[PDB]
Amino acid sequence: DKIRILWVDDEIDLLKPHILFLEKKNYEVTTSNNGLDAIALFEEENFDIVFLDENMPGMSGLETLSEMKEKKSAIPMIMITKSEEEYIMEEAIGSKIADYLIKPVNPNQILLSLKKNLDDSRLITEKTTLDYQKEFRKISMELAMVNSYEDWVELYKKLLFWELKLEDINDQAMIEILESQKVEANSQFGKYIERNYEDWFAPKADKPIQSHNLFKELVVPEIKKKDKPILFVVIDNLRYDQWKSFETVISNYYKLEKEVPYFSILPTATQYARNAIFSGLMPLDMEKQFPQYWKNDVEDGGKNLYEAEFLSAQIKRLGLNIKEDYFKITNYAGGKKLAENFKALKGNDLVTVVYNFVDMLSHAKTEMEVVKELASDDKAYRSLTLSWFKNSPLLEIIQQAQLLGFKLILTTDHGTINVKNPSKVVGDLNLRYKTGRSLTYEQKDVYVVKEPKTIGLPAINMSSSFIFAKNDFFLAYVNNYNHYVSYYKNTYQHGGISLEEMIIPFLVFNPK
Amino acid sequence: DKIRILWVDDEIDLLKPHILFLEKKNYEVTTSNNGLDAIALFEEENFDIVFLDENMPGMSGLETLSEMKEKKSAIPMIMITKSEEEYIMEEAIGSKIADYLIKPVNPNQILLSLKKNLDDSRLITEKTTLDYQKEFRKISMELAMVNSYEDWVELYKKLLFWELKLEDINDQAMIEILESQKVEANSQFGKYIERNYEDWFAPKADKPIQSHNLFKELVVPEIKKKDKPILFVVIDNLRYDQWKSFETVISNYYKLEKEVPYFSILPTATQYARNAIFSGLMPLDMEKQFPQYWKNDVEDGGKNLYEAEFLSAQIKRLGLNIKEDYFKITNYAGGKKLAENFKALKGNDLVTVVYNFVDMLSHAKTEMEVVKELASDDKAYRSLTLSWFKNSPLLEIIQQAQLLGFKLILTTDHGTINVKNPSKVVGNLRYKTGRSLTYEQKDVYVVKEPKTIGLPAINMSSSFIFAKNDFFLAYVNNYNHYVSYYKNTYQHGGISLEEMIIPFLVFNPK
Ligand SMILES: [Mg+2]
Ligand SMILES: [Mg+2]
Ligand SMILES: [Zn+2]
Ligand SMILES: [Zn+2]
Ligand SMILES: [Zn+2]
Ligand SMILES: [Zn+2]
């Protein structure tokens, strides 16, 4: 019932006030004056934590710790010693010491170390649970008052902060409260976009940075600095909560210098948003200025085959004379090949890398039972994304760029949303947007644009219209309605309006 | 270069010796005497770490911490304060403080905290690399001296310990040395099994616990204790290293009482090993005693459809009068359904649950490009398995059993191995049974009389071959296509530490 401590020190008799203090706090303390006797004790009994002196006659604390870690690696071990040498600090940290306390140590410092190493996950759960109970009413109130794109960014950031904090907590009732705030936030954001989207295209409108502005406004100033070559990575289909899931992994190689949440253009689909990043033009202007590259929905083949050409035309148009190359990664083998030969690009000013894995992974949830279990909810999907990133050729490419002193620019073209509710469409395959001459649809469920050219979109031919699903709706054809509902319900789809699909990260980092 | 520190304290002028000490160690220090001014600086500038006083006029150190974590949650924050109250310690730990130092603080204690929070992964990499450099020759020596099944279990445990230890090191030479020891271990283990396997079937032989002995020897004594209902989970195709990857997750709900590494029977395939768990009979005895349930390789349909029937016959045969139920989970929906209705099984003595996800996931890497990237190497596969377990209906079922005070028995039928080298065959990629097989003798353990190792046979013509090492049996007819497609895939059925030495775990709910 009591927490058992094994304390190893050659002068353990001189530390009796610490033992008495800890026994008052309900800790059980077992002492040892030599590393070898402590190892025998540790093998016979089940201690919750070990305290070790470094400098002892015979076996050192680091030698003793090494034998105990081999026998029970999950038991935390703390160094409490007079040793102040940095090389001893480094050897102990490197040996996975849970803490290092320099003598004379305050008995409350030992107590802090005990609480931090043994009760932290419980304390974090209780603190987060209590903090959210006191915060949710203020979130709902802030949600009701959001009336601008900057307030939407801040509200989305607040929801994302509580989502990653609450994912681990036991309280299902509170998890459901946050989920209701998320669906209400998406309901208000879809009406905000319906209401202001077209106005953003008017001359000198107050609008956020969008897909077609991204390269000129945020990448070009980094290039003009001319201090470091740039690795510009566009991870297709990266939700903001997916970046937050691997932010601390990337911090081991890159120090975040700038973060700019930006808005993807509509539709939040690759063919439109990703090509607009590389060309710096709206789809209607890409059709007008580059008919040889732009492809409308009705044309067969790949919709993003000419991004290098679009990018080189944008770079030339902006007056830059740089050494730049484009790579599109569609599979493991290609990612690995680019990671292995990255040094060949050392002399480049810009290296653009499109990485498709996360988009293919989001769509695999529709097609594969194994991905349905791996990404059953938003928490599972974040966990799966973090597992991917940590073991990906993309991280190996990022590590190669860090070794060459490259600045890292990490961004995406759009996010994706788990669709839950069907919405009947009649048209002529994307579940969150549809374009065509005579579309039949539910007015309340979609943002309708009857003149696509007003929002920089090509009109296939004069009576063409664009509909964009709002909330968690999926556009389902009446033709085989029950089969579309059954198959596409609870799958990740992008193309329409939501915080997940539209508000996306633009990140700049310096190598460390 | 230079690590940037933001230090917030109302008595920041009294801390100048600490600042000068840190500046000498190449740290850049920015000071602030109030939490609100520190929040303004923290938003405008990119600091690597923040030091905060708890008691300040105006915003407290915990109120300031809370604003700073909301703005940039990835930056470590340390509290440096005179407060010694346990409730302040708890509120700070609960707020995800990286460290908490009580004033008067030794300047070297701050330096330790800086090194531990900012350089630990690099220091751990360097220390682990050197520890393995000084250990690898002793591992090779131990490997050469292994001459028993118990020494194999201990050597496998040692290799698994270093595999997890090394999984993030950069030193290619060391990574290759470990890999070489793993291939050499499977080589020696294959020779050890090729000798010893048949002898283990002789009366009163010194043999390890196998598939057909598992239930009677290790589950039945737990049932005979009679002071907790048992949830018996068989996760199909669970490598020892996959159990080691989620061991600390399961420790949040269950305390490990007993661990018994056991040996799967040959072939290390579900049809044989998993049915032998549930029947407590070798496949040849399952064919003889239950012809209505046992299915040979040539019969179409599911090969593990009658495990509840086999289990109930074993339980009846062992003299047990228990309330028992069997569940086979083949998909997410069924797993979720069992988690949702677990309480209906509260009054049971035994609840057996077969969980197929990990086997389906190992096979998905062969075909799906997305799974090739998620499980490209052994480290990625462990990471993927840990991501799965943490968010699985299986863990929800385990949590439901913990709430009901059930004892947990966690085991598997076999592991799997990443195959790398082809081996020609004519007539599963790790075992083959048939009448008159053509094969490479050096690459397989050959049993020309399958009944001698408790396996079925049709006249003296049929035999079984079991791939050793990382070999995969590729048909001569379509050789180049089999090699190209199945190279670097997870396959089970043959002999390896990964396939054969598997965990049997007993836990008490906490
Ligand atoms: Mg000493
Ligand atoms: Mg103060
Ligand atoms: Zn895309
Ligand atoms: Zn997509
Ligand atoms: Zn199996
Ligand atoms: Zn299998």
Residue numbers in the entry:
A (entry chain A): 2 to 429, 434 to 517
B (entry chain B): 2 to 428, 435 to 517
Kindly provide excerpts from the paper associated with this entry:
The type IX secretion system (T9SS) is a large multi-protein transenvelope complex distributed into the Bacteroidetes phylum and responsible for the secretion of proteins involved in pathogenesis, carbohydrate utilization or gliding motility. In Porphyromonas gingivalis, the two-component system PorY sensor and response regulator PorX participate to T9SS gene regulation. Here, we present the crystal structure of PorXFj, the Flavobacterium johnsoniae PorX homolog.
In this study we produced and purified the F. johnsoniae PorX homolog (Fjoh_2906, called hereafter PorXFj) and solved its structure by X-ray crystallography at 2.0 Å resolution. Similarly to the recently released P. gingivalis PorXPg structure, PorXFj displays three distinct domains: a N-terminal CheY-like RD (residues 2–121), followed by a three-helix bundle domain (HBD, residues 122–205), and a C-terminal PglZ domain (residues 206–517). Two PorXFj molecules are present in the asymmetric unit. While not activated and monomeric in solution, PorXFj crystallized as a dimer identical to active PorX. The dimer is stabilized by a network of electrostatic interactions (21 hydrogen bonds and 6 salt bridges), as well as hydrophobic patches (involving 21 hydrophobic residues from each monomer), principally between the N- and C-terminal domain of each monomer. The putative binding site of the metal supposed to stabilize the phosphoryl group is clearly occupied by an ion that is octahedrally coordinated by the carboxylate oxygens of D11 and D54, the main chain-carbonyl oxygen of N56 and three water molecules. By comparison with the PorXPg structure, and accordingly to the coordination number and the bond lengths between the ion and its ligands, a Mg2+ ion was modelled in the structure. Despite the absence of BeF3 that mimics the activating phosphorylation of the RD, the side chains of the two PorXFj highly conserved ‘switch’ residues T82 and Y101 are oriented towards the active site, in a conformation corresponding to the active state of RDs. The active site coordinates two Zn2+ ions: Zn1 is coordinated by the catalytic T271, D237, D414 and H415 residues while Zn2 is coordinated by residues H364, H499, D360 and a water molecule. In contrast, the two monomers of the PorXFj dimer adopt the HH conformation with two coordinated Zn2+ ions and are therefore likely to be active.
